[PDB]
């Protein structure tokens, strides 16, 4: 059956030496993958000159709304995704992670793009960097979206998630993606891409697909391109030395295989609940998705006195794990994806048995079965410091070796001896042991879950990488980083430090910054609707003379009788020299000056961003406030009954009769829009 | 009165009834000020100056 | 604060120096209100209601 | 408190219940003062001084 490849806007398939996809639980071939003869230069050309200006013409709020719309459209027809993912040997609970975690990644990146990203093509991440004493020369860092494509080369583990956790930072960052899934499970990836394309939500050229080898894609990439890799280390280290990638200097992000740890502490005794949740965490993480996930626990570090208890409780819990067909009832673990992956797991087990030991069903694996079944395997290494094969070789399945430690000093060394891991676990109830574990073991792990009795209730676990936490790891884990909240959309952008005058940086950033030109137009800025506000719409409020009675009435009403406000003696002995006005009263009298009393588009305030009191305000010291608009950033009006609005930011600059800026800060404010969109 | 903030969601029975809050609510800056009246020690101690406020978000209205 | 009348000849030290008064003055309506604080009996008597004020002129400023 | 006008139709609950208004009402001079707090610009403008009031009649009580 033809498994095509979405290139240059059309569904195409190759003609050549075709690899073929076997069914996992049964064994027959029901897909074939090939990409020979497909013009990759024309695919990259169509993407760059058709979908890259279409994505870059959108704002970040519109791209987040696009991600939310694709998330809803792909959550609606989610059952065909389970029907296509049942062919990968996974169960319903194992495919639930693969589908719903990717769709929740789309919802999470939609929420992050809606909350903290501007209504602009560009995104300034800094506030202001002053580079001049007079103030006429300043700078700030911009983040412009790159004008090329993102080549995503995924592994066979998560088609839906692993494509779809890279696709949301790519689209939200502003680039079109070209996804090369692994040819063992590309049918679910093409189901995902077809559900994306046949919806009219994304622009054309914004997503591509190759079910098969790229061939001539990497040899044609421009310097504005990025490549993200997930898979074996031997493939990605040869794609790092590719001559066009090192010649044009394009960012190659790699996620290789890692030796993830689960360290047990000395405080955990088997009468505690920590022991049972430790065993449950190891068993669930080793059996979920048949151990074919990149964050699966593969090295269990226990104390020497707790070797027998752990090595018996794991057997008593894992002999309940039934390995069979996912559709029939009473089956916990599914199967591997291919017989070739089964042979790879068995040969890595045979490498690990050259110096290790055995606790359970290990190398006994039937290679003649009609299905890629591998039993849950618990190994043992009595000399972990004298065996480098444990700390250099992963068996990518239900295999996880066990090894003792010596009183939390050998345990940290065995957790760090993995050569840089992708995930890690300490199960303790002592916070100082966790502090000592993060102080040494976070240098090699990109994610560490400290699991105790309070955390284990509502935890997502160890094999669900969160879309707002860094899914990366140094060394053997690849070196790159993914999913770091809004850190992942910065891999698809260029960070340009833009210099100039502040009145020029304000028109570049489309945000009034600190010292730009103002626009005072005789009416109050809180009387303006959202569409008639501009960043730079200022307001010079009338003055208010601070006195001793102001300090007295605010210290009475607030109840803040602080000695630098209410004592004549101790304020003379303090740094101020005399008693000063409350900073919160400077804030309150500022808001009394600039806030219009009438009913207008201003709905609520609810916000204050960065308050700093520079110089003290005294009695007999006047106060004048310079309200000016800073940042508009409308909201998408998620329903039709809800009022259209936008979160307008105002930079508030208070000053005295000497015009020095006491109490400069920034408020958020909800301002209703005139015309809606949804 | 003291601050001068005569906003309609605090000083108007009619307009706050038609707003999102339903009735007139306590000022957010007075919640801030009365909070500081609650936790700040009046006496002389190691606390020298305040000069700072990191991230203020008013979640639910105070009535 | 209470009336909400933050006029610049009453609440601004700078602009009252640049005005005809020379410095900031007492509100005329507060002179009226404190007058009525002085001459009005607090007890129950023959006075029923006020409802009236005939011809108010503020001649010299109160400091 | 501020003006000092502790008249029984504003500060007493017993005597104002037996009065013509039925209960204690807002001061007329505070209606005047809050009115002036509503319509007067705080900033410096063409308005120099007030000094005057022509014909004040309190028609209906404010509660």
Swiss-Prot record, chains B, C, D:
| Highest rank taxon of the organism | Bacteria
What does the entry say induces or represses the expression of this protein? Activated by cAMP receptor protein (CRP) and integration host factor (IHF). Inhibited by PaaX.
Q: Where are the transmembrane segments?
A: none
Tell me the null mutant phenotype: Disruption causes the conversion of phenylacetate (PA) into 2-hydroxyphenylacetate (2-HPA).
Q: What family does the database annotate?
A: In the N-terminal section; belongs to the aldehyde dehydrogenase family.
Role played? Catalyzes the hydrolytic ring cleavage of 2-oxepin-2(3H)-ylideneacetyl-CoA (oxepin-CoA) via the open-chain aldehyde intermediate to yield 3-oxo-5,6-dehydrosuberyl-CoA. The enzyme consists of a C-terminal (R)-specific enoyl-CoA hydratase domain (formerly MaoC) that cleaves the ring and produces the highly reactive 3-oxo-5,6-dehydrosuberyl-CoA semialdehyde and an N-terminal NADP-dependent aldehyde dehydrogenase domain that oxidizes the aldehyde to 3-oxo-5,6-dehydrosuberyl-CoA. Can also use crotonyl-CoA as substrate.
Q: What is this protein called?
A: Bifunctional protein PaaZ
Organism from which the protein derives: Escherichia coli (strain K12)
As recorded in Swiss-Prot or TrEMBL, the protein's gene is named paaZ
Q: Which residues of the full protein are shown?
A: 557 to 619 of 681
